[PDB]
């Protein structure tokens, strides 16, 4: 009975356990999208640039809008954030039990 | 008297975490990589903490 | 486990796992039938029964 019941009480732990892990990942998800959506967006007004009839104000301008991007990706990178650890702002392995 | 070797200065403890966060203390007494944690008197000397 | 933990939060669960271990210790010095001390020395008690 004492051991069924000390796997019991670690089996539960392991699921809150295996929550957090899951909930962080979905976290890593959303960002991860959300500067996807934000990088394919600026890769566009990349290629716009190619075109040679551009006038320099408005390779500038073009500029000015990817940098604008950039910001918000560098931003929104920042913000990311789950239980006070930003996943996107550090290279890092994690180590969840669930034994 | 302790027989502790080396210079002695006095230094202000800074912490950092997994996270990134970072936080700072009071002050002590560092001798290489070795520290103490330090007491100010009211004159402006510095003792260890015993 | 949790490698999610802080090092705050860490030496928050450890501050529980040194009370719960110096409890331990508490009972096993305190208890005693009559005196004896039932949890405190390896002992053999004899007990006529003829």
Same mark, same amino acid.
């Given at each position: 009975?004492?051991?069924?019941?000390?796997?019991?009480?670690?089996?539960?732990?392991?699921?809150?356990?295996?929550?957090?892990?899951?909930?962080?990942?979905?976290?890593?998800?959303?960002?991860?999208?959300?500067?996807?959506?934000?990088?394919?967006?600026?890769?566009?007004?990349?290629?716009?640039?190619?075109?040679?009839?551009?006038?320099?104000?408005?390779?500038?301008?073009?500029?000015?809008?990817?940098?604008?991007?950039?910001?918000?990706?560098?931003?929104?990178?920042?913000?990311?954030?789950?239980?006070?650890?930003?996943?996107?702002?550090?290279?890092?392995?994690?180590?969840?039990?669930?034994? | 008297?302790?027989?502790?070797?080396?210079?002695?200065?006095?230094? !202000?403890?800074?912490?950092?975490?997994?996270?990134?966060?970072? #936080?700072?203390?009071?002050?002590?007494? !560092?001798?290489?990589?070795?520290?103490?944690?330090?007491?100010?008197?009211?004159?402006?000397? #510095?003792? #260890?903490?015993?």
């Amino acid at each position: 009975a004492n051991r069924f019941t000390a796997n019991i009480k670690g089996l539960t732990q392991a699921s809150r356990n295996a929550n957090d892990g899951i909930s962080i990942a979905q976290t890593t998800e959303g960002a991860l999208n959300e500067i996807n959506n934000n990088l394919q967006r600026v890769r566009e007004l990349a290629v716009q640039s190619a075109n040679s009839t551009n006038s320099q104000s408005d390779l500038d301008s073009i500029q000015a809008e990817i940098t604008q991007r950039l910001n918000e990706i560098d931003r929104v990178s920042g913000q990311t954030q789950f239980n006070g650890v930003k996943v996107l702002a550090q290279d890092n392995t994690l180590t969840i039990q669930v034994g | 008297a302790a027989g502790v070797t080396g210079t002695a200065s006095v230094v !202000k403890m800074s912490y950092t975490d997994n996270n990134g966060k970072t #936080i700072d203390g009071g002050l002590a007494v !560092k001798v290489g990589d070795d520290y103490y944690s330090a007491t100010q008197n009211k004159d402006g000397s #510095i003792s #260890i903490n015993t």
